[PDB]
Amino acid sequence: DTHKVFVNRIINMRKIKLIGLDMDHTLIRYNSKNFESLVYDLVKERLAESFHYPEEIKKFKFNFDDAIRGLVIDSKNGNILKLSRYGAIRLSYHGTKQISFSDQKKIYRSIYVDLGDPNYMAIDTSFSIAFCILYGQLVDLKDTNPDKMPSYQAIAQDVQYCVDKVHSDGTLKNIIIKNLKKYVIREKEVVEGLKHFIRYGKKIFILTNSEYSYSKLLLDYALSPFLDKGEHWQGLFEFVITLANKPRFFYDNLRFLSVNPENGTMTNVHGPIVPGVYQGGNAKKFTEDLGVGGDEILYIGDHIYGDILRLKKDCNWRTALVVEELGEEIASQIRALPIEKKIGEAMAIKKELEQKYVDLCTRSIDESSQQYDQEIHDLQLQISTVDLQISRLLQEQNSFYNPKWERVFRAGAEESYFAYQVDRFACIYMEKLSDLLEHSPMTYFRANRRLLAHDIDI
Amino acid sequence: KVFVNRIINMRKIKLIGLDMDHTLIRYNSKNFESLVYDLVKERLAESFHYPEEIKKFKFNFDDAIRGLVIDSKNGNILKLSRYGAIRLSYHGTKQISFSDQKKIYRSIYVDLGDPNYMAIDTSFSIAFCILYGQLVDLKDTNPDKMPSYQAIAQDVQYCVDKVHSDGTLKNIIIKNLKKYVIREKEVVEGLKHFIRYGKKIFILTNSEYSYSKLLLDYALSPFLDKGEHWQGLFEFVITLANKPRFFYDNLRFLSVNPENGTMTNVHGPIVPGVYQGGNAKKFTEDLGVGGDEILYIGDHIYGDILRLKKDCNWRTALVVEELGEEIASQIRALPIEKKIGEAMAIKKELEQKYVDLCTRSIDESYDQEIHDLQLQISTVDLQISRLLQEQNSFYNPKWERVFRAGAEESYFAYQVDRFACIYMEKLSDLLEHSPMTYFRANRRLLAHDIDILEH
Amino acid sequence: DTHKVFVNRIINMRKIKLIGLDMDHTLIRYNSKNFESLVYDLVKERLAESFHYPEEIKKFKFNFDDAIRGLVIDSKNGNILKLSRYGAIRLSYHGTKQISFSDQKKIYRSIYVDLGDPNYMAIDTSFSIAFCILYGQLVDLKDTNPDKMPSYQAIAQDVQYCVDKVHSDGTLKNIIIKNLKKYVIREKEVVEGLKHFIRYGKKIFILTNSEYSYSKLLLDYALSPFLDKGEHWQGLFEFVITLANKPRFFYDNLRFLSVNPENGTMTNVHGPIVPGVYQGGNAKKFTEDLGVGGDEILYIGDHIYGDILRLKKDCNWRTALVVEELGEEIASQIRALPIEKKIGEAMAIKKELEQKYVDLCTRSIDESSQQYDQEIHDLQLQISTVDLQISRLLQEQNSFYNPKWERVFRAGAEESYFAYQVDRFACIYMEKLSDLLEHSPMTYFRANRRLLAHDIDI
Amino acid sequence: KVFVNRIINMRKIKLIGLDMDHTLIRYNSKNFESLVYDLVKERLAESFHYPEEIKKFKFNFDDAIRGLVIDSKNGNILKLSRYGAIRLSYHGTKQISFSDQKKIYRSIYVDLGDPNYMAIDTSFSIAFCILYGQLVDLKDTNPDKMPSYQAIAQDVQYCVDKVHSDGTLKNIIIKNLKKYVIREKEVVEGLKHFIRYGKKIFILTNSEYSYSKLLLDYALSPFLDKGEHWQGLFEFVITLANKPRFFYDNLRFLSVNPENGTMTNVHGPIVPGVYQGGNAKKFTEDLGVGGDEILYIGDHIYGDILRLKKDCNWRTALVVEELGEEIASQIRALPIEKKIGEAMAIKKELEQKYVDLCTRSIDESYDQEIHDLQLQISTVDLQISRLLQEQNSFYNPKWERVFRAGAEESYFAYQVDRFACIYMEKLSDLLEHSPMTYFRANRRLLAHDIDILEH
Ligand SMILES: Nc1nc2c(ncn2[C@@H]2O[C@H](COP(=O)(O)O)[C@@H](O)[C@H]2O)c(=O)[nH]1
Ligand SMILES: Nc1nc2c(ncn2[C@@H]2O[C@H](COP(=O)(O)O)[C@@H](O)[C@H]2O)c(=O)[nH]1
Ligand SMILES: [Mg+2]
Ligand SMILES: [Mg+2]
């Protein structure tokens, strides 16, 4: 376990006084497949029941790999898109069927899409992958008998409704509570890590959207097992804020509620908040009452809270991210190394051949001569041969990543739209929290130069 | 020579549209900037009765840099990162303190959507900043004379716009072409080379035709055989294009009689000749080609890129004159960079050995060995930040590099990346290449992921 | 001919120096039915040709009364709506079929619609009625074989495209030019009226979206016939601005072009514009160069230029309106007078009976008595009888107006959304220009009190 | 008594939701306005160090009127027509000249969409205007002390908001209930009457519960038999409702223990009792009724009406205290109105005879007969405008009527028309009517179209 932390922007951990941790999926790890699957089932169920959809949907099978993180839903046309950082359509599907390059240009009349347009759903959530798989299948069925089901737009909204409902019903909560060892992953390192950081004067607080009754259970289940006899998980946290109501917690002005740690009853807050348990709240008041600078607080989450601008504009806290999927992406890039290198040597040669060819052709034209005509014809075949070697090497490279969508962070040779989001929202990111907590709580994180096209390589 | 952001096969390009002022025709920046600088302060202490003392203000080309943003509300000039983060700020000529900055701006990120910020890349951006700075500099000395910070900014803008239409600016440079425009044989040769390869070239300028004729004759003719008319270099010459709107709007074309200058309304498709106004839509269709077969080259990112790239579809390239100095300076700082690279690598090696031990104390619950390691980390870090500081002296002393905002790329760098498929210092750099060249984006991100073998 | 001018807001004609006249449909009258029909044909044609729509559309028949002015198109659901001034749905149709009250609530989940939403098309134009009739029929056909035709949204946009095209092709212009006596109505009064106003020192200018070559023809054809031997229609106008490009002419900054009245060639303008012919332009410069106050200029048009706010915000000219349809509305309200009165006497009685009934019932309940039980039962039947008399009188009142849409200015008992537009954009309005020109060019126009619910009637 | 804009059959209303402060519970406006007035100026010359001289400022209830709008940018107070046209303006306490107005504002129409204008109808609107006026009044006497026009406005707002949460305002009125709140037996009787008819009443206040108990006990109990608790008058009592958001947002409900005040999160539907927060959506569903069966009555048009009427669906009524004076004054001016009506009728008769002759000179191409007619027109017009002027003395001398902006209805009048189905001077006016009454909008538009017989 390398425990690597990737840096997008400088952050001096030495100057960070408080570290705010998201609970579900950040501080406490969940079995992604099992959890996505549950959400899929609960959501698919709520559709056939409270929305009266074809009895056929209950038959839908869930396959984790049918979708990947970072995808965008075009509710208008019932399509799913893989975008580049600037919104360029790398690839698209209508339901499960992949759209061809030709038909793509017919539909979008451009290569770029405007995420500003409300028709597109591009929210990074813990249920995005399930959303995509389900939505895909739903439109596949809607195409069979385009009367038995609502419109593409309507379906997407219904599904979103169920997801929000299932996340409020408590139906999801109760099921994972009754099956904790199947859903939550325990990790000694996390506890050691927190202790490490606290040991150096760091203050750690929890900022979750789950209610306290649920957080008390889960925190106990996942942390206590690694605490010394007598210790209490509560000693690890300065504050524990529940039903935080993020992202609004960061930019809105909802009030704090003091929670009685025993029974759970609450009282309105008057004056500054003091170490303890709370509900709701807002970053503004939290930062003021702790008498510190916003940039002295680091919040770590697992998914981007919709609009990065509105959030980084009215908050000012340092934000970091945990991206669970980095696990397999890295594992896959390593398994593809030899091919990645092969593709590099091949491209090098290709561009070599191409330059020589360009110049020879312009010489024959500039010089009005036919002496290069022989060589030019060979370069042509030769380039046709390497172009073939490469095209095949590429297909080979694809087998190391998700067959339908390729990499989470790459949209062709450039960054995926999700890559941009990560870059804009997170100063640093890692596959999991213990990756960060294994570093020095004094670490000065810097980013390796990104190199501009006019920059000289070294 | 030519930097690639996105692929573009010149073999597929059928038409190359060129911006006239500052793209096809080069100007002596220093000279031009000052002229506009003088004409604006001059127009201020007149059509606005500004304190006669401003006439005393001197122009120092290096007081501002390209890419800066003006905060009219607070009378500040900001250098934002690609994501809108303030990485260097000033109030007039005074650099705002790290602490002072915190009080003025709640967040370090500004919203350029707020019309209060002036974030327009123009050929007079530098002059604008320099002046606006001194104006506010000698505005706090009596906040009862000169209007509000935001008022001043709006006035200065009005002067630049008026002086650009009064003909005040054009008339001066037209009566002293030798002092403002620079001739370059290469430009005409390259154009003829591309035309020899089937390319159709056309001009798309915001300037009037009468002015265009004078400038084009002066700058291109000296490189044209006897009887060879510069107009033969261009398939179409569109004047008073009214960009950016020309690109996404629907204003109509006016046919211009090259002789008397008079104009007639257009009926039917346009044909090779001189026009006024127009819009990219009608042009593309009239030429029966796809937008991706047209390459437009300008010098400034006029307006909102998204509206211009979503509604146009034309390939767009950019000429960025400031590259000359930026490159040279980076070439001088090259040895420092190399040093910073080595230290980062040694830093990575040490921080990894650190986490290994720190992670090795959990797989078996040697407490000082870590300490000496932390110590080394701290030392190489200190060396790194001092190295970056050392590097700052090779660039504009007041605002640093144009493409970098602190360690990150600047907002301007982002704009170039997003707006331009290829960019160069000057137009002849592109025209020097073969008309059938295939530009490929650096596989920098390819070798970038070599960090995978580190594992 | 009463020549009535309706006043929404005070306007002192004495203080008005320049009167700007819209040409097509304001200064020059057109035969509405014939003109709408032409637009319908040309637009329906352009669809089956450049858009490849079912060959069946060519069969579509045009009936002027199938639609009325002021309607709103819900492109999203292929529906046409009659709105109240606050956006309340008075009545709706899906194509030609009328939607029931029940299904209406199903579709809109409210009684109010947000015109702000881009899905609704609510632009008042000279081709709105044709647009509605055509769109209605198109969706009717789209429902037959929902595959042979685009989506409701797509159809509405295609149709709009054709309308704009046909208005630029010049196809419409050439046809009316070759048939002037079938399309344009001549009226001596207009000419006398202009002379009247000019006689009193009023300056009159034309502001049309048509090009000069066409305006010169039409103005000559429709005005000359009433000019004294030797006079020239051009003497009636101070300025004549063509290809004005409204509404943008009012708020944008497009430049003026000087037009050579003989040949038509143009030159860019430098300095102030002087009496003569022009192309393009903008209100700002026009008002400045004439050295007058914007409120000293009155512009009269025939249709509301989309957004009333953006226009009245950046212009400041007094705006008046000519509403051709007032002709039949007034004619119909007069033919309905006796019934309107009958409905009034009946409602009076009804509310009389209802009050007595309300009070008797609350007395029996407040007093816990059964002595009023007899009377209350009679009031019930009696009210049931008058309620029936009225319901029938109403149905009778409907036969005086368009069967599908009722009145242009009324949406039930309240004002129609179109009524609001007229009220917000026009300080005064009349059925036709000569109505205004027949008044004193010194007339001080005032509005009759509108009476607020708390206002005492006199 | 009760004015109807839109139909509402009380037989169909199942629940009546009431605003507490200024709706269910009446306050002595004069007193209350001044208290807030004093607390704000007090908080200004303290948390903002404003010129000690402001403490000298006196409060004159008649210096402002309801419905006015504040132009923070230019430090002005405007009275707009229903369409946003300025029909009366002031800079501080100084009435802006017709000409001066023209220079400041390009158009006579303002865009209330521009966040620069403060157009919020609150129970302290009057105090806000009066103070803000004097502040700018004694701000131009030294534009170096007190911040910018727009700054001042934003500060004053902060004080009003803080003083409303510091508890500063609540504490004062709670310790002197007799001086601020007014008791009214009628209110309790009517409530009980409606409850006797099946109606369910509930409170929806932005105030805290502790404060609510004190105020409700003081104002309702004195009219309740021994052992009859005011809380029995209400099915639900929702506190810290956080309106307007309560109506269109999705904030959660908190169950309040009437005893200790502590709260618990809500699971399942709500039941009769005390709550905090919440949203109209969950409330309506939990009660298993349609929005149109709920009537909410407030005293101020909180926020954007469109967002509140499009996303809510509840029937909304409004209590407008200023009606008392407005009506009385109109009743006094009644004889003038009658006169104006007669002259308008004589004007119409004459202008028609005018056009007839003018139209009769074209049907046969008597030139002075018209002249004498024009003369009469002019005379009756003069009489009309002088009559309207005569009428202005019966209303606020500085701002005229609340519902009229010049001759047109004011922006406030529009808001009432759009937001309220029925409106009254005070709540008991509605409660006085039978619980099964059917309110019908005046058939004024019906008899309005009698102008058709004129033909
Ligand atoms: N500022 C910035 N915006 C980006 C970048 N990559 C993509 N974007 C897009 O730019 C959008 C905002 O548009 P802008 O205000 O820059 O015109 C963002 O919401 C995002 O969708 C980037 O690197 N920098
Ligand atoms: N100001 C105003 N707006 C109205 C009236 N009747 C309808 N409206 C609607 O109000 C809209 C603007 O929303 P507002 O800014 O008033 O919230 C207008 O575009 C129009 O659709 C009216 O009498 N006055
Ligand atoms: Mg989480
Ligand atoms: Mg017209």
Side-chain angles (χ1 to χ4, degrees), chain C residues 85-86 112 414-415 452-453, chain D residues 4-6 82 301 305 309 316 318 403 409-423 441-442:
Chain C
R85 69 138 58 239
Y86 293 132
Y112 307 106
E414 19 181 45
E415 313 176 75
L452 294 169
Chain D
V4 197
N5 290 323
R6 288 182 287 298
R82 76 143 69 224
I301 304 156
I305 312 182
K309 299 301 300 179
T316 55
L318 198 75
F403 289 84
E409 26 278 348
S410 61
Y411 184 74
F412 178 70
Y414 149 58
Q415 292 193 279
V416 175
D417 186 36
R418 156 96 88 154
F419 175 96
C421 56
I422 51 168
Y423 62 111
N442 28 72

Side-chain angles (χ1 to χ4, degrees), chain A residues 399-431:
Chain A
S399 60
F400 292 91
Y401 309 107
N402 175 289
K404 292 173 71 180
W405 309 95
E406 282 148 352
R407 278 171 269 184
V408 167
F409 292 86
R410 293 293 117 77
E414 19 181 45
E415 313 176 75
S416 62
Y417 174 64
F418 174 76
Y420 142 74
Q421 282 187 280
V422 164
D423 188 51
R424 190 199 215 306
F425 173 98
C427 54
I428 69 171
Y429 59 103
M430 52 276 333
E431 164 192 32

Side-chain angles (χ1 to χ4, degrees), chain A residues 327-345:
Chain A
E328 262 315 303
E329 282 264 305
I330 311 287
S332 288
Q333 300 177 77
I334 303 181
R335 256 146 34 203
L337 259 188
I339 288 286
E340 235 116 51
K341 295 177 185 172
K342 203 70 60 56
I343 298 183
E345 297 166 8

Side-chain angles (χ1 to χ4, degrees), chain D residues 314-328:
Chain D
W314 280 10
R315 300 313 302 283
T316 55
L318 198 75
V319 135
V320 179
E321 206 183 12
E322 293 78 352
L323 271 184
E325 268 315 298
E326 279 264 321
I327 310 308

Side-chain angles (χ1 to χ4, degrees), chain D residues 143-156:
Chain D
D144 293 62
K145 304 309 176 179
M146 310 176 89
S148 66
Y149 289 125
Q150 196 179 199
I152 297 181
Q154 298 221 304
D155 292 332
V156 175

Side-chain angles (χ1 to χ4, degrees), chain B residues 17-25 203-204 243 296-299:
Chain B
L18 301 165
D19 175 295
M20 189 198 263
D21 301 295
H22 304 287
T23 295
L24 168 57
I25 293 174
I203 297 175
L204 190 61
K243 294 172 292 180
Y296 166 80
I297 310 175
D299 43 270

